[PDB]
Design a protein around this nucleic acid. Structure first.
Ligand SMILES: [Mg+2]
Ligand SMILES: [Mg+2]
Ligand SMILES: [Mg+2]
Ligand SMILES: [Mg+2]
Ligand SMILES: [Mg+2]
Ligand SMILES: [Mg+2]
Ligand SMILES: [Mg+2]
Ligand SMILES: [Mg+2]
Ligand SMILES: [Mg+2]
Ligand SMILES: [Mg+2]
Ligand SMILES: [Mg+2]
Ligand SMILES: [Mg+2]
Ligand SMILES: [Mg+2]
Ligand SMILES: [Mg+2]
Ligand SMILES: [Mg+2]
Ligand SMILES: [Mg+2]
Ligand SMILES: [Mg+2]
Ligand SMILES: [Mg+2]
Ligand SMILES: [Mg+2]
Ligand SMILES: [Mg+2]
Ligand SMILES: [Mg+2]
Lengths: 262, 143, 206, 177
RNA sequence: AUCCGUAACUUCGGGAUAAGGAUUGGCUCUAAGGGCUGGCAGCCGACUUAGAACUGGUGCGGACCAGGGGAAUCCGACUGU
RNA sequence: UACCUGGUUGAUCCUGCCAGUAGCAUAUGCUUGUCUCAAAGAUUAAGCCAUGCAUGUCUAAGUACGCACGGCCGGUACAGUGAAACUGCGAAUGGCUCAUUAAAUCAGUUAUGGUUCCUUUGGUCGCUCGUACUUGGAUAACUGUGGUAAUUCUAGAGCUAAUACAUGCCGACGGGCGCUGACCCCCUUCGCGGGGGGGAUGCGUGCAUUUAUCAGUGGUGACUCUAGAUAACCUCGGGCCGAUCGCACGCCCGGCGGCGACGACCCAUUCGAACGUCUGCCCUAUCAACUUUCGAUGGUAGUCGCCGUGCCUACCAUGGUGACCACGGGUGACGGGGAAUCAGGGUUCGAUUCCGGAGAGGGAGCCUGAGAAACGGCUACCACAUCCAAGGAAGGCAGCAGGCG
RNA sequence: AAGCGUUUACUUUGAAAAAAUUAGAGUGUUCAAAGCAGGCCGCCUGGAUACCGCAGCUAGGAAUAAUGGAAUAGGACCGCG
C-alpha cells in the first residue's frame, strides 16, 4: 500500500464484534482515537447491532447527529468513534447509562449502570512521563494525559477519574490479592484475584490470577486490568461475573433452566 | 596502544580536558544478569561498538554459538547448530547458520571452539546485528 | 534518483539480489551539500514527514565551545586544516563533521581579560591606545580585588593553547552536522586531543 | 500560442510550467506540464500585439479615450474604503460604503450593498475578550493545580520522612539488640 | 604505453599484441615506495607508481618511432640452407 | 468401507507393467420440466482498444456588490437561497491482474533504547520583560478585445474578498532569578589584613533546534533516557506565542461575559508505514567452487537518509559463503490461511473474493502532499495508435460493461 | 516474599497465537445445502469450543541421547598475616 488504510472488510473484522457475513462486504472501520483497532467496538455496532435501536447506518447517523449520544462526558458525532474498555455512553432521552465492560466471553456486554456510577470511571495508566518543566504525567489506556498526579501511582496502576472535571479521585496499586479484569487474549473476560507475579528480564512478565471458584490461570500483564482491592470491586458487574465455567456446565445451566421454564 | 587511526579516538561521553588543580572511563551495566568484565573497567582501550563501553544496547534475543573464525578485526564469525524436524520423515537434520558477531576487545582469552553468548542489538554493519556478552571457555584446554 | 537501499547489492554469500520492486520514495538519497567558507547561504529542503533540513552551502561563523571553562562564543571560521575522512576536503575547504578549523582567538581573549584580568596573547612591547582593555583590567574595588585574586589561583593555561592564543588562531573540531541542521558548532581542542591533531598536522606538513 | 515574459528568443520555446507561472493553469495541486510559448522579442512572426497606452497625447482617439467605462465593482475592504474616501480611523465606513443600483424590466428597482470585510464589530471585540479570558482561565488553572500539587508533595515528603525515621529507628533497635 | 577482455582448435606448451573497447596534453596538488647519527628525535639523498582538481576550438604515443585483422583449403612439421 | 479384477502360458506359481474402478477440476457432446444458492477472459495474448461511466465535496460556523431568484423594517455594511470561482480536504482508499520475484515476497515470534506519522482523542497553547476598536497589495468568478484548423489551450485591460500570500503590536507586566556591581554600613586589628550585610546602572532571563560543561525529580533488565543548573546559536529558502467564523444576548459604573467551529510549536494515543532478530520454500551437479579495489567481508572518520547500516565516499585489513548443496540455471513458481484425494502416513494444487507483496504497454525521473517514485498525476526514450491548414496538439480499460485477436 | 544455583535435546501445562475454511454446541431456513438466528405471553437469551504444522517464551520432571568438572592440583571448603 502507498499509505494508510481507510476500509475494513467484513471478513477482516474482529470476532468479538459478531458482525454477520451475508449483509455486507465491508465492516465499519473505526476512526482513530483513544483505543486500538481490535480492542474497541464502534458506536454504529453498539447502537445498531447490539441495542437494535436503529435499522441502518443512516439511522445511526441521524441518532448521532440529533446530539443524543454522550460518550464519557462529550458528544461524539461520528458513527465510527472507537468506544473501548471502561467507556461510558450516556443517552439522555431514554435515561440510559452504559458501561462498556467485557462479558464472560470475548464480546462486550450491554451493561446498565446508575448515573452515580456513570459519573466516574476507572482507567489503567501505561507510563509516567516527565514534561518540559519537571511535571509528572500519567498516560492512560484511553490516552488521557493527566498531570500532577499522586507520586505513589506507578506504571501498572489504575486511577478513578471524574468525567466532569478530568481529575483523579482514588487509585488502585498493582499488588497481590487484588482483583483482575483480563483485557485481551484467550482469557478475555475473566475476573479473579491476583495470586502470583513472575518477573522476567527482556521477555514480558506474567501474572497468575486465581478465580473466585478456584480456577487459577496465567496471563501476561499487558492484557490485565485491576478493578479494586481484595475481593471488593469499585464497579458493577454483569451476569456471569467473569468466571468462564465449562461448556458442559453451560449446557447444563441452559437445559435445566429451559426445562424449568417450559 | 590505542589511537592508530586518523581522527582522535575517544569516548564521546566523558570529558577529559578539565582543569587539574588517569582518564575517567565510562562503562555501564548491560542487563539480563550478565556480569561486566574486569578488563572493560581497568584497561585503556576504547570501542564504540562494545556493548559495555559503547553506544549500543542489547534488546530482544539472547542466543549462543561456537566460535569458528577470528580473522576479522573487532568481530568474529560464530556457528550455530540445530536439528530441524521434517514431519514426513520423523527425523532430524543438521543445519547451521554462521552469523557475523561483533567481538568486543574486553574478551581477550578467546580461542576457536569456544561456546560464546551473543545478544541482538541494532545493526552495526551489513551482516552484524549481535554483540558478544559472555564467553564460556571450551572443554579442557586449561594450558 | 540516487537510492539508499539494501536490495540493490549482493548478499552475504556473494550472490546477486534480483529486483522485486523499483526504487521507492523512502529509499532515497540526495546530492551532497559540501558547504564552503564564505557569506551565509542556507537552503531549506522538505524531507520525509513534512520536516525541514537546512543545507548550508557557504558558512563562516560557528558557536564554538571552550570546554575547560564552559564558555562558548560565536566565532568566524577562516581555514580548514585537517580532516580525517578525505584530504580533498582539506584541499578544497569543505566543512563536515569532525573537521579541524582555525578560528579567531579574540572572543576567548576578551572573556579571559574580563574574567581573570590577566594578559592573554600579547607579545611583550605592545600597549593598547584606546585604553579600553586597560580600563577593564584596572579599576577594582577593595573587596572584589580579593575575588579576582581568588580567580587568579585557577587561571593556569596550557602552553600549546597559550602559543595558539599568541598566534591568534585556535583549533576547533566540528561537532554538529553542517549539511543537516545548518550550524557548524563544535569545540576547541585541548590537551591530548590538541597534541594528537598538532602531531598529525606536523606529519602532514613535514 | 501566447507569448511569455523573460525567455529572450524570437522563435518557439517549450517550457515546464507550474503554479505561479504565466500561460498555465494548474489543475491538480502542484501539477507541472510542458507548454509551448513564443519569444518576447517582437518580430513579424506574430498575429496580435497587445498595447497599453500609458501617456495620453494631444489628440483624442474616439475608440479608446472618448468612451469612458466605469468600474465594475466597488471597494469592499474598510481600509480600502478609507483610502478611497480619505477617512480617519474613528469615523464611520458604513455610511460611506459604495452601493450599486439594480434595475431591469419585470423586477423592482433595488440597491444592493456589499458586506464590509475587516470592520471592527462587537462580535470580533467579544472574541478578542474571549481568548484573553481563556488565557486567564488557563493561568488560574495552572496556579491552582500547582498549589494543589505543592501541598500534596509536601504531604508525601512528610510521610516519606516519617518512614525513613521509622527505618532508622528500626536499625537502632537492631543495633541495640 | 596503461586498464579491461580474449574464441574455435590444440601436441595443453600455444593460438595471443587473437579478436573487441576505454585513456593519453599542460598546470596545481595529495598519498605510497629510503639511508646516516643519537615504535622516538635530528640530518639528507633519489627516481618511479597511484589518485584528485582546474584548463585548452575533443586536442593530446600531436614530429619521430611504430603489428591491418578474421574464417577456410593445399603443401612443407618446425629453426635452417 | 485399512477393498480389487482382466491380460504373458498347453496349463501353474511369481516379478512386472498395461487396462479397467472411484472422487476433485477444465473443456466438449446429447438431453433438460420445478426451486434455493452459486464459479464465470486465469491457463494461450501483464496482447490492442472504439464508445459511456467509474472522485469529488458546504455547513447556523473560511470568502456572496452574477437581480440567477427573492423580503420590505431600511439607509446604522451584509434579510434569506444560490450559478460560478478562490481557499481547505480527499484523489496514496477501494477495484483489477499475477508479469517480475526462490531466505526474496510471505507465515509464526520479536524490537525501534535505531525512525517518521494527516486525521481523531487527551495534554499544552498572559510562563518570554520588549494602528491593535484590527496593517499591505495582488488575484479568480463578473465586464470587455481576441489568437489557433484544433485541446479540460489561454493572453492583454478593467475591477473586487480570505482561515490563500505577508507584516506586526497593545496586554499579562509589577516585580522576581543569575551575573556586572558604582558605593554605603557593622565588628576586630597600631596598621596592611580578616568576617558579615544592603545596594544605583547595564546585560541575559518561555517552549522548540544546535553545541559544550556540571550534578544525579521520575523510570527501565539495561541510556549518551526524561527532567535540573551554566554558557551561547536562532538558518531571512526565518519553529510556535490566534490581526478567524457562527448562535443565543447578559452584568458593572466605556469595561467584563457563554456554547462552539476553525488555524498550530511540542508531548502522548490511534491508523499505520519501513528497516531489522530466529526458523521455514519446488527441481537441477550434463551448475563445484562463488564474490572481490566498478563493495566483495569488516574497522575508523564523514556525506546522505526520517533513523541503524558499505547506502555511499576516503584510508586500511583480506576478508565473506560452500558437499549441512553456496553460487548459477529452470519454474507451465506471488507467498500464506486454505482445496481435493484421503485408514494411518502422504501426494497434488492454491491466479481466484481474507492478510501481506508487485504493477498499470516496457524501463527511468520528478512536483504536490503526512503518506506516491502515483500513471482515471506529470516529464523524456522505445513499441502501438488519433486530428492537422504540415506550424502543431492529444493517449494509456492486468477498473465496470463491451469490441478485435 | 525477592535473587543465584552446567547447558541442551526430550515430555506436560500456560500464554501469544487474524478472521474466512475443517470438526463441532444450540437453532424446524416447511427438510437439506445454508445462515447466526431466534422463542414467549416487553421479556428470555445465543452468536461457544477443538485444531492452527515448524520456530520463539514460560513453569514442573530428570527415565533416554549428547555435554563438562580435580590428574604438570592455576581443586574446592573453614580460617589467617
Ligand atoms: Mg490498493
Ligand atoms: Mg511420517
Ligand atoms: Mg588466429
Ligand atoms: Mg581436405
Ligand atoms: Mg619449411
Ligand atoms: Mg514367456
Ligand atoms: Mg493362451
Ligand atoms: Mg490405470
Ligand atoms: Mg411453482
Ligand atoms: Mg416459477
Ligand atoms: Mg487476457
Ligand atoms: Mg499465468
Ligand atoms: Mg519464469
Ligand atoms: Mg510467474
Ligand atoms: Mg494465492
Ligand atoms: Mg504502484
Ligand atoms: Mg494491456
Ligand atoms: Mg508511474
Ligand atoms: Mg484506467
Ligand atoms: Mg489508481
Ligand atoms: Mg484461525
Amino acid at each position: 500500500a502507498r499509505g494508510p488504510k481507510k476500509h475494513l472488510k467484513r471478513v477482516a473484522a474482529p470476532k468479538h464484534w459478531m458482525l454477520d457475513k451475508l449483509t455486507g462486504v465491508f465492516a465499519p472501520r473505526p476512526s482513530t482515537g483513544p483505543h486500538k483497532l481490535r480492542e474497541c467496538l464502534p458506536l454504529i455496532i453498539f447502537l445498531r447491532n447490539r441495542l437494535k435501536y436503529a435499522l441502518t447506518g443512516d439511522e445511526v447517523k441521524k441518532i448521532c447527529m440529533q446530539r443524543f449520544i454522550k460518550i464519557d462526558g462529550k458528544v461524539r458525532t461520528d458513527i465510527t468513534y472507537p468506544a473501548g474498555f471502561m467507556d461510558v455512553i450516556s443517552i439522555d432521552k431514554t435515561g440510559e447509562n452504559f458501561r462498556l465492560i467485557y462479558d464472560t466471553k470475548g464480546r462486550f456486554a450491554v451493561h446498565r449502570i446508575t448515573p452515580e456510577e456513570a459519573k466516574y470511571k476507572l482507567c489503567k495508566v501505561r507510563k509516567i512521563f516527565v514534561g518540559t518543566k519537571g511535571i509528572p504525567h500519567l498516560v492512560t489506556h484511553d490516552a488521557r494525559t493527566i498531570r500532577y498526579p499522586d507520586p505513589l501511582i506507578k506504571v501498572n496502576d489504575t486511577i478513578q477519574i471524574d468525567l466532569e472535571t478530568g481529575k483523579i479521585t482514588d487509585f488502585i496499586k498493582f499488588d497481590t490479592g487484588n482483583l483482575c479484569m483480563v483485557t485481551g487474549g484467550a482469557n478475555l473476560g475473566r475476573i479473579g484475584v491476583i495470586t502470583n507475579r513472575e518477573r522476567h528480564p527482556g521477555s514480558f512478565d506474567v501474572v497468575h490470577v486465581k478465580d473466585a471458584n478456584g480456577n487459577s490461570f496465567a496471563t501476561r500483564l499487558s492484557n490485565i486490568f485491576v478493578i479494586g482491592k481484595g475481593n471488593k470491586p469499585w464497579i458493577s458487574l454483569p451476569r456471569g461475573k467473569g468466571i468462564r465455567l465449562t461448556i458442559a456446565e453451560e449446557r447444563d445451566k441452559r437445559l435445566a433452566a429451559k426445562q424449568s421454564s417450559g | 596502544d590505542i589511537q592508530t587511526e586518523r581522527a582522535y579516538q575517544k569516548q564521546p561521553t566523558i570529558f577529559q580536558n578539565k582543569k587539574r588543580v588517569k582518564l575517567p572511563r565510562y562503562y555501564k551495566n548491560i542487563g539480563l544478569g550478565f556480569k561486566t568484565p574486569k578488563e572493560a573497567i581497568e584497561g585503556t582501550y576504547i570501542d564504540k561498538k562494545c556493548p559495555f563501553t559503547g553506544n549500543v544496547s542489547i534488546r530482544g534475543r539472547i542466543l549462543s554459538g561456537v566460535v569458528t573464525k577470528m580473522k576479522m578485526q573487532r568481530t568474529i564469525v560464530i556457528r550455530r547448530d540445530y536439528l530441524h524436524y521434517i514431519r514426513k520423515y520423523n527425523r532430524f537434520e543438521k543445519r547451521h547458520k554462521n552469523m557475523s558477531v561483533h567481538l568486543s576487545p574486553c574478551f581477550r582469552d578467546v580461542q576457536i571452539g569456544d561456546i560464546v553468548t551473543v545478544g541482538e542489538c541494532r545493526p552495526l554493519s551489513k551482516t552484524v546485528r549481535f554483540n558478544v556478552l559472555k564467553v564460556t571457555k571450551a572443554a579442557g584446554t586449561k594450558k | 534518483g540516487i537510492s539508499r537501499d539494501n536490495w540493490h547489492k549482493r548478499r552475504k554469500t556473494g550472490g546477486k539480489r534480483k529486483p522485486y520492486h523499483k526504487k521507492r520514495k523512502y529509499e532515497l538519497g540526495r546530492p551532497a551539500a559540501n558547504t564552503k567558507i564564505g557569506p551565509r547561504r542556507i537552503h531549506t529542503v522538505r524531507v520525509r514527514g513534512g520536516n525541514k533540513k537546512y543545507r548550508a552551502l557557504r558558512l563562516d561563523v560557528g558557536n564554538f565551545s571552550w570546554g575547560s571553562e564552559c564558555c562558548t562564543r560565536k566565532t568566524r571560521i577562516i581555514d580548514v586544516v585537517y580532516n580525517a575522512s578525505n584530504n580533498e576536503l582539506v584541499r578544497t575547504k569543505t566543512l563536515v563533521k569532525n573537521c579541524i578549523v582555525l578560528i579567531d582567538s579574540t572572543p576567548y581573549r576578551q572573556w579571559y581579560e574580563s574574567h581573570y584580568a590577566l594578559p592573554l596573547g600579547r607579545k611583550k612591547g605592545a600597549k593598547l591606545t584606546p585604553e579600553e582593555e586597560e580600563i577593564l583590567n584596572k579599576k577594582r574595588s577593595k573587596k572584589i580585588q580579593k575575588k579576582y585574586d581568588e580567580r587568579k589561583k585557577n587561571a593556569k593555561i596550557s602552553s600549546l593553547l597559550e602559543e595558539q592564543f599568541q598566534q591568534g588562531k585556535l583549533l576547533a573540531c566540528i561537532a554538529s552536522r553542517p549539511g543537516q541542521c545548518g550550524r557548524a558548532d563544535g569545540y576547541v581542542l585541548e590537551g591530548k586531543e590538541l597534541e594528537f591533531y598538532l602531531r598529525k598536522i606536523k606529519a602532514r606538513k613535514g | 500560442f501566447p507569448m511569455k515574459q523573460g525567455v529572450l528568443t524570437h522563435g518557439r520555446v517549450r517550457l515546464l510550467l507550474s503554479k505561479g507561472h504565466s500561460c498555465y493553469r494548474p489543475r491538480r495541486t502542484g501539477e507541472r506540464k510542458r507548454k509551448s510559448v513564443r519569444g518576447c522579442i517582437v518580430d513579424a512572426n506574430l498575429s496580435v500585439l497587445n498595447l497599453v497606452i500609458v501617456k495620453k497625447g494631444e489628440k483624442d482617439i474616439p475608440g479608446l479615450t472618448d468612451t469612458t467605462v466605469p468600474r465594475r465593482l466597488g471597494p469592499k475592504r474598510a481600509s480600502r474604503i478609507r483610502k478611497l474616501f480619505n477617512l480617519s480611523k474613528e469615523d464611520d465606513v458604513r455610511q460611506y460604503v459604495v452601493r450599486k443600483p439594480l434595475n431591469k424590466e419585470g423586477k423592482k428597482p433595488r440597491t444592493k450593498a456589499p458586506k464590509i470585510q475587516r470592520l471592527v464589530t462587537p462580535r470580533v471585540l467579544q472574541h478578542k475578550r474571549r481568548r484573553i479570558a481563556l488565557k486567564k482561565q488557563r493561568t488560574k488553572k495552572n496556579k491552582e493545580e500547582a498549589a494543589e500539587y505543592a501541598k500534596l508533595l509536601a504531604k508525601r515528603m512528610k510521610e516519606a520522612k516519617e518512614k525513613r525515621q521509622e527505618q532508622i529507628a528500626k536499625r537502632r533497635r537492631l543495633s541495640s539488640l
